[PDB]
Design a protein around this ligand. Structure first.
Ligand SMILES: [Cl-]
Ligand SMILES: [Cl-]
Lengths: 128, 120
């Protein structure tokens, strides 16, 4: 009964619950979430089918740059779009390292290294 | 466009283990080969199963012996996957600014391994 790591963020003003996965090489957004956040126009479909990790769904394309809002911070991020994914957004080591983040399980916060801004991990009742 | 995954040096029963640090993994897992190499098969409760479960073994990081619990996978490529269960139990921080795993129960810290020092 260990609660997995989620944070609240926003893309293009739209609320997103992001799964925090230090063992994932690539950050991934679901197509459903890219559509909901109105960022399909950013999806470079020339990256269709490029994936670093094994899975069960096709990669649709690659967002080279979109701002992921965490608290007051707008973080420039790169990520690929999976046709389907259990969670809307998987925050992987690529972006965790890009922003020099700290996954602090004592305080139960994700720290954004750049700015020292912090956002709390979600309690079990707020998990998708 | 080429991300170095997070490993740490640790020791189990005196044997060096390079542990993959995975905040998205619900459970800590050691390969059967590694359990054998570390001479801790005696501690593998086979009623679980995934070959079994080690209920309590010391995992050494730097100078600390941390009680961990983990399951044993018949083949895992990697010797050891340090999951959220153990990262939470030891109130760790994965500090990617400093590039260290902080052990919250002791204040110790250990560096993530450079690319040249990774397994496989
Ligand atoms: Cl890119
Ligand atoms: Cl050995």
């Amino acid at each position: 009964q260990v609660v997995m790591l989620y944070i609240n963020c926003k893309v293009n003003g739209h609320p997103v619950k992001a799964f925090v996965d230090s063992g994932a090489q690539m950050t991934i957004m679901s197509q459903a979430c890219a559509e909901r956040c109105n960022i399909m126009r950013l999806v470079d479909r020339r990256w269709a089918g490029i994936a670093k990790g094994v899975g069960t769904q096709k990669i649709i394309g690659r967002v080279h740059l979109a701002q992921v809002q965490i608290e007051g911070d707008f973080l420039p991020c790169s990520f690929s779009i999976l046709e389907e994914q259990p969670m809307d957004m998987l925050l992987g080591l690529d972006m965790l390292k890009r922003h020099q983040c700290s996954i602090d399980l004592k305080k139960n916060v994700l720290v954004i290294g750049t700015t020292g801004s912090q956002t709390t991990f979600l309690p079990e009742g707020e998990l998708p």
